[PDB]
Design an enzyme around this catalytic site. Structure first.
Site, short mmCIF file in Angstrom:
data_model
loop_
_atom_site.label_atom_id
_atom_site.label_comp_id
_atom_site.label_asym_id
_atom_site.label_seq_id
_atom_site.Cartn_x
_atom_site.Cartn_y
_atom_site.Cartn_z
N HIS A 12 0.72 -1.24 0.00
CA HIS A 12 0.00 0.00 0.00
C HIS A 12 0.76 1.30 0.00
CE1 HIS A 12 -3.43 -2.56 0.51
NE2 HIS A 12 -2.96 -3.06 1.64
N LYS A 41 -4.47 -9.74 -8.06
CA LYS A 41 -5.12 -9.31 -6.83
C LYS A 41 -6.23 -8.38 -7.34
CE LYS A 41 -4.33 -7.47 -2.28
NZ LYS A 41 -4.11 -6.15 -1.68
N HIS A 119 -3.05 -3.55 8.17
CA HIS A 119 -4.12 -3.84 7.24
C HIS A 119 -4.92 -2.60 6.98
CE1 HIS A 119 -4.42 -8.01 9.22
NE2 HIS A 119 -3.87 -8.17 8.01
N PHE A 120 -5.53 -2.55 5.81
CA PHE A 120 -6.38 -1.44 5.51
C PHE A 120 -7.74 -1.92 5.92
CE2 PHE A 120 -4.87 2.32 4.26
CZ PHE A 120 -4.44 2.52 2.95
N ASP A 121 -8.58 -1.00 6.43
CA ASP A 121 -9.97 -1.43 6.57
C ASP A 121 -10.80 -0.89 5.42
OD1 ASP A 121 -11.18 -3.19 8.44
OD2 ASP A 121 -12.42 -1.56 9.32
CL LIG Z 1 -6.78 -2.12 -0.34
#
Ligand SMILES: [Cl-]
Ligand SMILES: [Cl-]
Ligand SMILES: [Cl-]
Length: 124
Positions: A12, A41, A119-121
């Protein structure tokens, strides 16, 4: 194995650009970050802020995670991001992505020591 923190950075972070300038940004980045290696992905966002600014979100607004956990934090300010999504066409190994640049708040799950994003939410 890659650590969770390193994985978040690789997937990211893109501090090298201020914003996606071309419709081909996602196709190049998804490839460069090795996110099209064994498959395409489907969805992935890139944050165009410094790593320090993104890490600082873990000390910002604490909010519940979509999963109910409470280690999520939302950024106080909006940040430059690029969302990458596979087009309805796209077939591995011919990955194709739509690039969408926007300014919005990010929400991340943080963990560890040091306490960093893993992590992304979402983004808003
Ligand atoms: Cl993402
Ligand atoms: Cl690490
Ligand atoms: Cl890699």
């Amino acid at each position: 194995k890659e650590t969770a923190a390193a994985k978040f950075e690789r997937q990211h972070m893109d501090s090298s650009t201020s914003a996606a300038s071309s419709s081909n940004y996602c196709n190049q980045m998804m490839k460069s970050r090795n996110l099209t290696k064994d498959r395409c992905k489907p969805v992935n966002g890139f944050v165009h802020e410094s790593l320090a600014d993104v890490q600082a979100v873990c000390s910002q607004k604490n909010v519940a995670c979509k999963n109910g956990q409470t280690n999520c934090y939302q950024s106080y300010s909006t940040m430059s991001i690029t969302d990458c999504r596979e087009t309805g066409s796209s077939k591995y190994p011919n990955c194709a992505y739509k690039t969408t640049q926007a300014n919005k708040h990010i929400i991340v799950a943080c963990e560890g020591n040091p306490y960093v994003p893993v992590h992304f939410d979402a983004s808003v």
